[PDB]
Amino acid sequence: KSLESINSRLQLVMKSGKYVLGYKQTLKMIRQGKAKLVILANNCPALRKSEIEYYAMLAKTGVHHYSGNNIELGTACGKYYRVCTLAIIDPGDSDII
Template sequence: MAPKSKNTENVNAKLGLVMKSGKYSLGYKSTVKALRAGKAKLVIIAGNTPVLRKSELEYYAMLSKTQVYYFNGGNNELGTVCGKLFRVGTLAILDAGDSDILSTL
């Protein structure tokens, strides 16, 4: 496996801080609900998300003027970074908490 870049480790650390101190919603359905309600501040999409689902999330993010970040790893890696023992395809950050992830991405 190739060594991770400094930026990837930085994003992973900030995402872990959001999981501890902020508010978020995991999964496709709850992410779409947060986007439609206008509550999402940032949407993170795993690298192996299906194209149709990804384009739908991009469309809702564009309508709600929400920033989208494309995670380099797959949904297994995103779940691990979030500290969960299951796969996470998409997540919406509702409140960053102590993390400054919204200003750096």
């Protein structure tokens, strides 16, 4: 995996792609086979990381383990709250996949 940060690519998804935020919707999208890529912050709860990784494995869906924390991920998503996980359904114009 490249050392390059995904931050700018994530911003491109926010602007041009399709995505969901949060455990409930991320898990739903994984389980329905709609998730093209899942992202997890480094300070997500361990039990939640494990659950998401497990279901993503069954769905053959890639998981990118974000190098930063949920403050950084929330900020990269243009939110004013912490974000632990999201599922990208359509990358739009981002070469993120």
